[PDB]
Amino acid sequence: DNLQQQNTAPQIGTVNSQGALPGMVWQNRDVYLQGPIWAKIPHTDGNFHPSP
Amino acid sequence: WLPGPCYRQQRVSTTTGQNNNSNFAWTAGTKYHLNGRNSLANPGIAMATHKD
Amino acid sequence: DGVGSSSGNWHCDSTWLGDRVITTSTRTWALPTYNNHLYKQISNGTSGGATNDNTYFGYSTPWGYFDFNRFHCHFSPRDWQRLINNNWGFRPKRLSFKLFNIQVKEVTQNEGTKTIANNLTSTIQVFTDSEYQLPYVLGSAHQGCLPPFPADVFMIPQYGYLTLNNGSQAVGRSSFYCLEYFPSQMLRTGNNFQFTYTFEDVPFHSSYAHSQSLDRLMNPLIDQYLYYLSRTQTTGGTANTQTLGFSQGGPNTMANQAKNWLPGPCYRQQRVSTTTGQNNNSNFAWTAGTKYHLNGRNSLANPGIAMATHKDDEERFFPSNGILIFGKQNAARDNADYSDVMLTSEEEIKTTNPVATEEYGIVADNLQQQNTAPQIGTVNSQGALPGMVWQNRDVYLQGPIWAKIPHTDGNFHPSPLMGGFGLKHPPPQILIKNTPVPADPPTTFNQSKLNSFITQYSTGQVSVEIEWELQKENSKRWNPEIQYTSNYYKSTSVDFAVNTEGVYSEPRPIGTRYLTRNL
Amino acid sequence: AHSQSLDRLMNPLIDQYLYYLSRTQTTGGTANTQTLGFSQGGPNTMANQAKN
Amino acid sequence: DGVGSSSGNWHCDSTWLGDRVITTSTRTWALPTYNNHLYKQISNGTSGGATNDNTYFGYSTPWGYFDFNRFHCHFSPRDWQRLINNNWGFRPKRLSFKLFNIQVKEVTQNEGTKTIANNLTSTIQVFTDSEYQLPYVLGSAHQGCLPPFPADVFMIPQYGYLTLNNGSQAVGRSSFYCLEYFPSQMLRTGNNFQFTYTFEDVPFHSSYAHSQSLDRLMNPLIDQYLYYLSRTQTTGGTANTQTLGFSQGGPNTMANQAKNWLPGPCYRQQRVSTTTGQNNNSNFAWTAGTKYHLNGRNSLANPGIAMATHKDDEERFFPSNGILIFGKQNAARDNADYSDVMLTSEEEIKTTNPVATEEYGIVADNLQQQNTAPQIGTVNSQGALPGMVWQNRDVYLQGPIWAKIPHTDGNFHPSPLMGGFGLKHPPPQILIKNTPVPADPPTTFNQSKLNSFITQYSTGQVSVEIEWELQKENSKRWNPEIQYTSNYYKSTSVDFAVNTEGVYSEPRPIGTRYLTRNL
Amino acid sequence: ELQKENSKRWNPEIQYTSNYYKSTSVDFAVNTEGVYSEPRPIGTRYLTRNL
């Protein structure tokens, strides 16, 4: 959170929402016997990892 | 490597004696703001439900 | 190849071929002598009034370059009206180029009398940098393009580049580029220069506004089969306790239903109004701006990522540095008025992108218990999440066309923030120069270099032809669309035409997004 | 190593054709009020120019 | 072949092809009118202040010659850095040459007003002396080469030669060379001149420093099998008598071991220090120099044979006339300071060559007996012995390239002392001249020659391409080498680039010997 | 597999070099007891390219 010195204690900050960083890995949500199957990707200019 | 992305949400318990005594289903929800409307991020991105 | 025979013809036309359009434009240029044929070092430091954010180090060359990286150099306003009304997309395919009718003239000033006469045996030097071994200046939105109106004569800019610095001082990784270390072609009057380029594959430009929003992609008549949490406290009276209650999403609770996608990324900016009575009474253009911090410098995020300008019924608000601003005819350079600029607006993308002056959402902050009230947190800047969709910034009749993607290890969605076509091998720079001609040397030998020259300049024509590829419109909408139209009532002078003194002027910015498509 | 930086990819000699907001309050004296003023990016204000 | 069509293009590039490198350079020249189209006799005698060592006799011609006998006319500093870091040798193979874009202009001065106009029907005369029938001026390290930086315009020198003399007077074996007794080609504007040359076979240039010395070519672990004389007098006490004692060379007596080779030749010079407080307080530049006596003249041995400059930990010493000294930018002609010159150093050859400021060795002087102590003698100058090895002087980025071996009956190791490639048929001289154009002759006849001319000058381009052959590096060294590097810290301006006023400057001399090879 | 360098820079580059002055022992070589040692980390980025 800040720049520690001889007269300043170091402070921290908690991240609640974090976007994509280089080097991340993740898993998608599981499907179910009574869940949906497909969905239509909307025709736009860009998207990031188009899974429903 | 890093873990996947995060978009934090509120914790609620199935045992009713451990929750707060207020109606927080809409006021404390996790939303996203589009065009001056507050829509509910449901079910949001794929994150694990509970730890051990 | 003679003196008394021309070397080209005036081509300026546009043909429409169903799924192609081929546009040609020819202008007349003039090239002065820059820096008296010298390379010079230019720099600016923290001494004086300059600050740390505005220091530079670089060089200035005697060369001049052609720039046509702007949309109205190829399209008349009627051709732009034909383009944006009947198509859903367009991208370039190939281009051509031709210099011809070179004339080199020289000027002599004695006793305040100025005589200009032909010089039949002097040359110019033109070449293209095809192998991308130079700094790339185009795509930085500078002046000195071709004129909009074909009956104007323009002046060719100067080439100069920047390198690394530490204040007004160079470092060990600086570079010096001598442009006479490249092979170039020398042309007398009666020679011509031409080449051909082929664009790479690049996505279509979305020339449509969506007719549907992300939060309203469902059926208004059928409930869902998928529950949500709705009640946590009972409603009987004063003795309310905890409970759990669930409900289905339906037609009357459409903010609570389960959805598949997210809006695009957000990087929040400051709101300023055009009505001056509603702003704060302080100077907040630089102190309250939206910046990004690189190498201990604060640079201005301008115009930032593609976000919508204003929400509904709020046409008087705009982000402080989040739009492209175009100047009118005879607007001043510094401290122009509001009535001398043309503010664009990107309200067509508010169905998927967030508003640039509002937050992204609300996230949780703590872990609620029996003795702790739940708290919330507002997100101002949000990066990419899985499942986002967004739209790019629109292009304009007087906006840029392409930009060069920097050769790095990685990038994320390489589209230029000013709008256009992000190419990894852009059309090459074309550099031009008059060859030096010395005055009389001394009769006795002297080892120093010569610095007495004959003052010259040169002029001629130039020609550019670009072939575009279209994408037709295939909708089944019943009611009519929205089209770009001209004004119907009478006026003092015709828009998009000359004045009574002969000065051409453009009245308004013209977007592209008029037709509609579903999500 | 790159021999050039992101914030310095422009021409040191030519102004831009693209304005930015520069002034919000007048500078006459004690009775300063609100206004709007715009300017062009140039060689001396290179932190304010429009970048890609 | 017309007026309005150019006759060549600007070629300036360098290509690397594994074991070749082909370098091209193109400049722009200008040629005045010399001596008003007259041959003249020039001489200097012992009358006045001149002495016997500085007399000459010769002629001065109206012609001008092209000189490119210098290394930086072909190599950029980056190309020189690529050359000297990865190779063990290089030699030239062939060259090319091309004059084009001739422009002949004339100048008229009336009432202090100077007007310069084209002259379309005047010529120039260029030819090459391929059969070596002229005096050879190149390879004498004169000025007037091509510029280092390609964006400069230079001036062409004047041709003149020397013959035999006795004071300021000729003798019967003098020669007069009229250059219009050779066939030459006449070029108007719209003509071009070109030829091709092929170098002969010549050894590679040793671009390496040895990593081993002559006195240390043995095994540090094994004794020899070969004795030496070590003791002559006994060591018991006061009554010491004569004896003979012998020992073996080993690891601790390595100055006494038997060796196979000798160091190179020596011709001793005077030591002078750069710190002025350590020199003598007298003017000894000419009285204490190292000379050679020819025909009753004392000429200065400059820079003499290739010897090492200084031994270890003595970087402040240099021989008084044994090195090449280069001037900085804007250094004066006479009486420059120490901080306006660049002193080279040849310390890389101290593993085989002697130090230039120390003796060669110690030899005997008499025949010792029972009543005669043995004496020694110090050798200051030593010619060639059987079994010597040596190294040549290094070449530089701003040093010469070739020199012509004089056609004599014999020579010993014909390499030039200034460094480079000793060729017996060097690249030919290229002489150029403006043809005279008379003013109006009289109406009545007069037998005298004409001496009223129109004053002219001419200008154009020139192009040189030389193909070099390389020798790759094939060592098995484990630790890293020494490389030529640029400075890492910040500075006021970039080295090897232009100033803020447009003047190019070279900061330091750059050698060649950086990689290492064993003996 | 390599990728060659194709720049048109005029002034010289920055190169990795060894030390010129004298020292107690040679870097990147053995000790007097036979133990090999590396003195410094060596990067890769020395040549320059434009953006």
User: What CA dihedral angle connects E46, E48, E54 and E56, to 10 degrees?
Assistant: -70
Report the b/e string of E110-131 with b at 16+ CB within 10 A.
eeeeeebebbeebbbbbbbbee
Task: Round to the nearest angstrom and report the end-to-end CA distance of chain C.
Answer: 59
Closest Cα of chain D to F39: distance in Å?
23
Cβ within 8 Å, pair C387-A49:
yes
Chain F residues whose CB is inside 8 A of the D6 CB are 51
Chain centre to alpha carbon of residue E352: 22
Helix ranges (DSSP H) in C46-103: 77-86
Report the b/e string of C401-423 with b at 16+ CB within 10 A.
bbbbbbeeeeeeeebbbbbbbbb
Kindly state whether D31 is in contact with chain C, defined as any CB-CB distance less than 8 angstroms. no
Binding residues of C for AMP: 415, 422
Kindly state whether C333 is in contact with chain D, defined as any CB-CB distance less than 8 angstroms. yes
Mutation choice for C interface testing from F4, F7, F8, F44 by most C CBs within 10 A: F8
Can you list the domains of chain C with their CATH numbers?
1-519 (2.170.30.10)
Cβ within 8 Å, pair A21-B2:
yes
Length of chain C: 519
Closest Cα of chain B to C231: distance in Å?
6
CA distances to C308, E85, E211, E352, F19 from E482, rounded to whole Å, are 58, 8, 12, 20, 7
Contacts for C476 with CB less than 8 Å, ≥ 6 apart: none
CA distances to C124, E101, E106, E434 from E454, rounded to whole Å, are 29, 22, 7, 11
Closest Cα of chain D to C5: distance in Å?
37
Ramachandran angles phi, psi of E71, nearest 5°? -75, -35
DSSP lists the bridge partners of residue E26 as: E463
User: Which technique was used to obtain these atomic coordinates?
Assistant: cryo-EM
Cβ within 8 Å, pair D19-C160:
no
H or E element in which residue E432 lies: strand E429-434
Q: How far apart are CA C318 and CA C307, in angstroms?
A: 11
Length of chain D: 52
Kindly state whether C166 is in contact with chain E, defined as any CB-CB distance less than 8 angstroms. yes
Query: What chain A residue is nearest to C206 in terms of C-alpha separation?
Result: A45
What token pair was written down for C319? 């982000």
Task: Round to the nearest angstrom and report the end-to-end CA distance of chain E.
Answer: 59
Kindly state whether D30 is in contact with chain C, defined as any CB-CB distance less than 8 angstroms. no
Q: How far apart are CA C471 and CA C84, in angstroms?
A: 11
**Helix, strand and coil in chain B, % to nearest 5:** 5, 20, 75
Closest Cα partner for E469 from E45, E98, E92? Answer: E92
Residue E134: other Cβ atoms inside 10 A: 15
DSSP lists the bridge partners of residue C517 as: C210
Q: Which of residues 449-468 of C touch E (CB under 8 A)?
A: 449-450, 454
Cβ within 8 Å, pair E78-F27:
no
Q: How far apart are CA E10 and CA E22, in angstroms?
A: 16
Closest Cα of chain F to C133: distance in Å?
6
Place of tokens 């040596």: E390
Cβ within 8 Å, pair F10-C178:
yes
CA distances to B32, C215, C311, C355, C405 from B35, rounded to whole Å, are 10, 10, 6, 7, 32
Residue E467, SS3 per DSSP = strand
Place of tokens 């188009």: A50
Closest Cα of chain E to C396: distance in Å?
40
Are the beta carbons of E504 and E149 closer than 8 angstroms?
yes
Query: What chain C residue is nearest to E104 in terms of C-alpha separation?
Result: C121
H or E element in which residue A34 lies: none
H or E element in which residue C116 lies: strand C113-118
Q: Do chains C and D touch (3 or more CB pairs under 8 A)?
A: yes
Please compute, for residue E424, the number of CA atoms within 13 A of its CA located in the half-sphere on the CB side. Answer: 10
Chain F residues whose CB is inside 8 A of the C173 CB are 14, 48
Q: How far apart are CA D22 and CA C272, in angstroms?
A: 12
Closest Cα partner for C162 from E515, D14, D52, E386? Answer: D14
Chain E residues whose CB is inside 8 A of the C441 CB are 30-32, 155, 457
Q: What is the DSSP letter of E274?
A: S
Length of chain E: 519
Report the b/e string of C8-34 with b at 16+ CB within 10 A.
beeeeebeeeeeebbbbbbbbbebebb
Strand C515-517 vs strand C208-210: parallel, antiparallel, or unpaired? parallel
Instruction: Confirm or deny that E43 is annotated as ligand binding.
Output: no
Are the beta carbons of C301 and D48 closer than 8 angstroms?
no
Longest Cα separation, chain E: 114
Contacts for C139 with CB less than 8 Å, ≥ 6 apart: C69, C400, C402, C403, C404, C416, C426, D52
Contacts for E43 with CB less than 8 Å, ≥ 6 apart: E55, E56, E57, E58, E165, E168, E169
Are the beta carbons of D34 and D24 closer than 8 angstroms?
yes
Q: How far apart are CA E381 and CA E393, in angstroms?
A: 19
What token pair was written down for C96? 């051509």
DSSP lists the bridge partners of residue C127 as: C431
Neighbors of chain B with 3 or more C-beta pairs under 8 Å: A, C
What is the Cα Rg of chain D in Å? 15
Q: What is the DSSP letter of E80?
A: H
Closest Cα partner for E481 from E80, E85, E88? Answer: E85
Place of tokens 């990819």: D9
Kindly state whether C353 is in contact with chain A, defined as any CB-CB distance less than 8 angstroms. no
Are the beta carbons of C357 and C269 closer than 8 angstroms?
yes
Query: What chain D residue is nearest to C176 in terms of C-alpha separation?
Result: D3
3-state DSSP of E164-216: CCCCCCCCCCCCCCCHHHCCCEEECECECEEEEEECCCCCCCCCEEECCCHHH
Cβ within 8 Å, pair F13-E481:
no
Name the residue type at position C203: P
Chain C residues whose CB is inside 8 A of the F48 CB are 173, 175
Q: How far apart are CA C519 and CA C212, in angstroms?
A: 6
Closest Cα of chain D to C331: distance in Å?
10
Place of tokens 């670009």: C466
Q: How far apart are CA C247 and CA C305, in angstroms?
A: 38
Q: Which of residues 484-513 of E touch F (CB under 8 A)?
A: 484-486, 488, 494-497
Please compute, for residue C348, the number of CA atoms within 13 A of its CA located in the half-sphere on the CB side. Answer: 21
Q: How far apart are CA C207 and CA C202, in angstroms?
A: 15
Q: What is the DSSP letter of E333?
A: S
Q: What angle do CA E26, E189, C457 make, to 5 degrees?
A: 70
Kindly state whether B4 is in contact with chain A, defined as any CB-CB distance less than 8 angstroms. yes
Chain E residues whose CB is inside 8 A of the C40 CB are 498, 500-502
Closest Cα of chain F to D27: distance in Å?
41
DSSP lists the bridge partners of residue C242 as: C233
Q: How far apart are CA E485 and CA E514, in angstroms?
A: 11
Chain D residues whose CB is inside 8 A of the C137 CB are 10-11
Closest Cα partner for C504 from C68, C30, C77? Answer: C77
Chain C residues whose CB is inside 8 A of the A16 CB are 363-365, 377, 379
Q: How far apart are CA E518 and CA E82, in angstroms?
A: 22
Query: What chain B residue is nearest to C240 in terms of C-alpha separation?
Result: B21
Contacts for C142 with CB less than 8 Å, ≥ 6 apart: C67, C157, D10, D11, D14, D15, D16, D17
CA distances to C203, E115, E307, E353, E410 from E205, rounded to whole Å, are 56, 52, 17, 17, 23
Cβ within 8 Å, pair A25-B8:
no
User: Is the sign of the CA dihedral E159, E163, E167, E169 positive or negative?
Assistant: negative
Kindly state whether D29 is in contact with chain C, defined as any CB-CB distance less than 8 angstroms. no
What token pair was written down for C60? 């200035």
What token pair was written down for E504? 């190019």
Kindly state whether C238 is in contact with chain B, defined as any CB-CB distance less than 8 angstroms. no
Place of tokens 């204000």: D45
Q: How far apart are CA E227 and CA E245, in angstroms?
A: 10
User: What CA dihedral angle connects C238, C242, C243 and C249, to 10 degrees?
Assistant: 80
Query: What chain A residue is nearest to C205 in terms of C-alpha separation?
Result: A45
CA distances to E357, E363, E375 from E378, rounded to whole Å, are 14, 6, 10
Query: What chain C residue is nearest to B36 in terms of C-alpha separation?
Result: C311
Q: What is the DSSP string of E208-260?
A: EEESS-GGG-S-SS---S-EEEEEEE--SSSS--EEEEEEE--SS-TTSS--S
Q: How far apart are CA C369 and CA B19, in angstroms?
A: 5
Cβ within 8 Å, pair B35-C257:
no
Cβ within 8 Å, pair F51-D1:
no
Are the beta carbons of F18 and F27 closer than 8 angstroms?
yes
Query: What chain F residue is nearest to C183 in terms of C-alpha separation?
Result: F8
Q: How far apart are CA E65 and CA E34, in angstroms?
A: 12
Kindly state whether B50 is in contact with chain C, defined as any CB-CB distance less than 8 angstroms. no
Residue among B7, B24, B45 minimizing CB distance to C232 = B24
Chain D residues whose CB is inside 8 A of the F50 CB are 2-4
Report the b/e string of E179-197 with b at 16+ CB within 10 A.
beeeebeebebbbbbeeeb
What token pair was written down for C510? 């013209």
Chain F residues whose CB is inside 8 A of the C162 CB are none
